[PDB]
Design a protein around this nucleic acid. Sequence first.
DNA 1: AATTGTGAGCG
DNA 2: CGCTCACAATT
Length: 51
Amino acid sequence: MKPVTLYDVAEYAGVSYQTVSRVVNQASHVSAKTREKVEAAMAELNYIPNR
DNA sequence: AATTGTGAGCG
DNA sequence: CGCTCACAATT
Ligand code: NA
């Protein structure tokens, strides 16, 4: 499968890789609108854990 | 005083 | 390259 990364979903949402990692694991500091971006980025794109 | 970004340490 | 963990320059 296409190795869709944390970055791809982050840029797609308009957020940082670390902000989007903190939507997956190590979760601190996530906002109303920013969260809803990450969700639409994860579900429209076929993100792969660890690739 | 809140977050992103950067650092670095694991794989 | 890809990611969790942890910490801090900037705002
Ligand atoms: Na992950």
